Design an enzyme around this catalytic site. Structure first.
Site, PDB file in Angstrom:
ATOM      1  N   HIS A  36     -18.300  41.793 -18.195  1.00 36.09           N
ATOM      2  CA  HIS A  36     -19.211  42.917 -17.608  1.00 36.09           C
ATOM      3  C   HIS A  36     -20.674  42.483 -17.688  1.00 36.09           C
ATOM      4  O   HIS A  36     -21.048  41.295 -18.313  1.00 36.09           O
ATOM      5  CB  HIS A  36     -18.957  44.095 -18.498  1.00 36.09           C
ATOM      6  CG  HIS A  36     -19.617  44.107 -19.671  1.00 36.09           C
ATOM      7  ND1 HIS A  36     -18.713  43.489 -20.869  1.00 36.09           N
ATOM      8  CD2 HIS A  36     -20.735  44.023 -20.272  1.00 36.09           C
ATOM      9  CE1 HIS A  36     -19.390  43.499 -21.853  1.00 36.09           C
ATOM     10  NE2 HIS A  36     -20.608  43.696 -21.738  1.00 36.09           N
ATOM     11  N   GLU A  70     -25.845  55.927 -21.710  1.00 35.94           N
ATOM     12  CA  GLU A  70     -25.242  54.651 -21.027  1.00 35.94           C
ATOM     13  C   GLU A  70     -23.834  55.173 -20.115  1.00 35.94           C
ATOM     14  O   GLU A  70     -23.478  56.105 -20.166  1.00 35.94           O
ATOM     15  CB  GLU A  70     -24.409  53.761 -21.830  1.00 35.94           C
ATOM     16  CG  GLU A  70     -23.625  54.246 -23.232  1.00 35.94           C
ATOM     17  CD  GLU A  70     -23.288  53.144 -24.104  1.00 35.94           C
ATOM     18  OE1 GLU A  70     -22.693  53.263 -25.251  1.00 35.94           O
ATOM     19  OE2 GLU A  70     -23.689  51.679 -23.779  1.00 35.94           O
ATOM     20  N   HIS A  74     -31.297  36.737 -10.237  1.00 38.68           N
ATOM     21  CA  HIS A  74     -30.326  37.979  -9.265  1.00 38.68           C
ATOM     22  C   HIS A  74     -28.737  38.065  -9.568  1.00 38.68           C
ATOM     23  O   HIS A  74     -28.213  37.001 -10.218  1.00 38.68           O
ATOM     24  CB  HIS A  74     -30.752  37.975  -8.031  1.00 38.68           C
ATOM     25  CG  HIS A  74     -30.522  36.792  -7.186  1.00 38.68           C
ATOM     26  ND1 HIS A  74     -31.549  35.751  -7.238  1.00 38.68           N
ATOM     27  CD2 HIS A  74     -29.558  36.350  -6.589  1.00 38.68           C
ATOM     28  CE1 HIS A  74     -31.018  34.742  -6.570  1.00 38.68           C
ATOM     29  NE2 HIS A  74     -29.625  34.886  -5.980  1.00 38.68           N
ATOM     30  N   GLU A 125     -28.745  41.198  -4.323  1.00 39.10           N
ATOM     31  CA  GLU A 125     -28.366  40.448  -3.188  1.00 39.10           C
ATOM     32  C   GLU A 125     -26.822  40.850  -2.708  1.00 39.10           C
ATOM     33  O   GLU A 125     -26.150  40.951  -3.396  1.00 39.10           O
ATOM     34  CB  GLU A 125     -28.621  39.078  -3.182  1.00 39.10           C
ATOM     35  CG  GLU A 125     -28.315  38.278  -2.004  1.00 39.10           C
ATOM     36  CD  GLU A 125     -28.117  36.805  -2.000  1.00 39.10           C
ATOM     37  OE1 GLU A 125     -28.661  36.071  -3.086  1.00 39.10           O
ATOM     38  OE2 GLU A 125     -27.413  36.174  -1.412  1.00 39.10           O
TER      39      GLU A 125
HETATM   40  C1  LIG Z   1     -28.498  32.749  -0.291  1.00 39.25           C
HETATM   41  C2  LIG Z   1     -27.989  32.192  -1.864  1.00 39.25           C
HETATM   42  O1  LIG Z   1     -28.072  33.569  -2.366  1.00 39.25           O
HETATM   43  C3  LIG Z   1     -29.123  31.360  -2.396  1.00 39.25           C
HETATM   44  O2  LIG Z   1     -30.439  31.694  -2.401  1.00 39.25           O
HETATM   45  P1  LIG Z   1     -28.687  31.015  -4.087  1.00 39.25           P
HETATM   46  O3  LIG Z   1     -29.053  32.234  -4.838  1.00 39.25           O
HETATM   47  O4  LIG Z   1     -27.088  30.471  -4.092  1.00 39.25           O
HETATM   48  O5  LIG Z   1     -29.603  29.706  -4.413  1.00 39.25           O
HETATM   49  C1  LIG Z   2     -19.826  45.846 -26.601  1.00 43.18           C
HETATM   50  C2  LIG Z   2     -20.640  45.789 -25.382  1.00 43.18           C
HETATM   51  O1  LIG Z   2     -21.287  44.640 -25.192  1.00 43.18           O
HETATM   52  C3  LIG Z   2     -21.558  46.988 -25.314  1.00 43.18           C
HETATM   53  O2  LIG Z   2     -22.468  46.982 -26.505  1.00 43.18           O
HETATM   54  P1  LIG Z   2     -22.443  46.885 -23.842  1.00 43.18           P
HETATM   55  O3  LIG Z   2     -23.393  45.678 -23.849  1.00 43.18           O
HETATM   56  O4  LIG Z   2     -21.603  47.013 -22.562  1.00 43.18           O
HETATM   57  O5  LIG Z   2     -23.505  48.319 -23.771  1.00 43.18           O
HETATM   58 MN   LIG Z   3     -22.041  43.976 -23.534  1.00 40.11          MN
HETATM   59 MN   LIG Z   4     -28.221  34.244  -4.348  1.00 36.29          MN
END
Ligand SMILES: C[C@H](O)[C@@H](O)P(=O)(O)O
Ligand SMILES: C[C@H](O)[C@@H](O)P(=O)(O)O
Ligand SMILES: [Mn+2]
Ligand SMILES: [Mn+2]
Lengths: 130, 122
Positions: free
Chosen positions: B7, B44, B69, B111
């Site tokens: 996650h 959360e 990103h 993105e």
């Molecule tokens: C168009 C893509 O997101 C690139 O800018 P990358 O993040 O893979 O370097």
């Molecule tokens: C056990 C998990 O890492 C949670 O602590 P979360 O980062 O999803 O808040």
């Molecule tokens: Mn976590």
């Molecule tokens: Mn990218």
């Protein structure tokens, strides 16, 4: 409609130094290097980490440490091992975070550019059965 | 070894604001909510987005905008669609396949990317 995760791009000061970090810990499979050719907008590498397409670019931008993090899935039997592998590379590891009896164990740690990472054991389901 | 992605957790200043954002654009699906202020526990929420477990927690926003990103996949035919959908949220949107970079209200860079890895390389 979103199909799924495309990729995650991290920015690092020292590319080569970060690359070894990824290959050692995450068994990251480098699949592309900007060096694989001449004339590249920037110095960068692409890896495959358990399916995920991770991109690393070199730059001066530095993010302040925050709880924003990416988490990878591991098994409970491998918690100690990864904690040994992380420790063996002297990377900083956060202390055990407070759980809720039914929340699997986790390992938190940074790379060299303030990127918080986590190796999570236990699943989402066990976190909903509540 | 790493089985895959578990996650991604993002920190935001306004939990309700970010939610509407996730729903309006990513069609994020809320599946969990907790965090009681009265009982001193930041709030959360857990959403599923294209099968990916996304956790949103309330806290401070990224003090600075960087180029780190998270990118999601879409078809290149829905590029214009999502471009406009995004302009509708009024968020700051920086002008293989096409992509769309834009921030939320916590300086996270997102993105939407058309085209795959298979393409990008091969
Ligand atoms: C168009 C893509 O997101 C690139 O800018 P990358 O993040 O893979 O370097
Ligand atoms: C056990 C998990 O890492 C949670 O602590 P979360 O980062 O999803 O808040
Ligand atoms: Mn976590
Ligand atoms: Mn990218």
């Amino acid at each position: 409609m979103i199909s799924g995760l495309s990729h995650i791009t991290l920015i690092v000061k020292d590319l080569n130094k970060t690359t070894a970090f990824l290959q050692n810990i995450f068994n990251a499979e480098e699949i592309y290097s900007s060096g694989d050719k001449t004339f590249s907008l920037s110095k960068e590498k692409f890896f495959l980490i358990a399916g995920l397409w991770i991109c690393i670019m070199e730059g001066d931008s530095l993010q302040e440490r925050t709880y924003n993090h990416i988490a990878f899935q591991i098994q409970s039997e491998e918690v100690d091992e990864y904690t040994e592998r992380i420790k063996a590379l002297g990377v900083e590891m956060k202390p055990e975070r407070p759980r809720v009896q039914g929340e699997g164990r986790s390992i938190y740690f940074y790379d060299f550019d303030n990127h918080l990472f986590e190796l999570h054991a236990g699943t989402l389901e066990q976190r909903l059965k509540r």
